[PDB]
């Protein structure tokens, strides 16, 4: 739980940049949802980067 939590905090820091992370209720459910979202975003960002670079080449 401690690893997933770290990944979420890092991911939120990346998404919100220089803006202070908004306070939210940290419970088992909110963490699971955020974790799924973080995994999904990371996987999609990777895919979109590869597509964007290819389109430049094309």
């Amino acid at each position: 739980m401690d690893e997933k939590s770290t990944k979420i905090i890092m991911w939120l820091k990346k998404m919100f940049g220089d803006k202070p992370l908004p306070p939210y209720e940290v419970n088992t459910r909110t963490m699971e949802i955020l974790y799924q979202l973080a995994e999904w975003n990371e996987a999609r960002d990777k895919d979109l980067s590869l597509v964007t670079e290819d389109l430049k080449l094309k």
Binding site: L50, E53, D54, L57, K58
Partner: protein
């Protein structure tokens, strides 16, 4: 007679050199027909890697 023979040898030599250069060029592996596509993806093929 020496000058005339000398000119003929030079012409034949220049022609010979130019032929060797062209043959070397035509023997380049990249120009030679459809080698069966390579089984491995070339490092230069960025699209297939992506």
């Amino acid at each position: 007679v020496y000058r005339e023979l000398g000119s003929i040898v030079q012409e034949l030599k220049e022609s010979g050199d130019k032929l060797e250069e062209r043959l070397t060029m035509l023997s380049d592996v990249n120009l030679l027909s459809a080698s069966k596509p390579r089984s491995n993806i070339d490092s230069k093929d960025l699209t297939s890697h992506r």
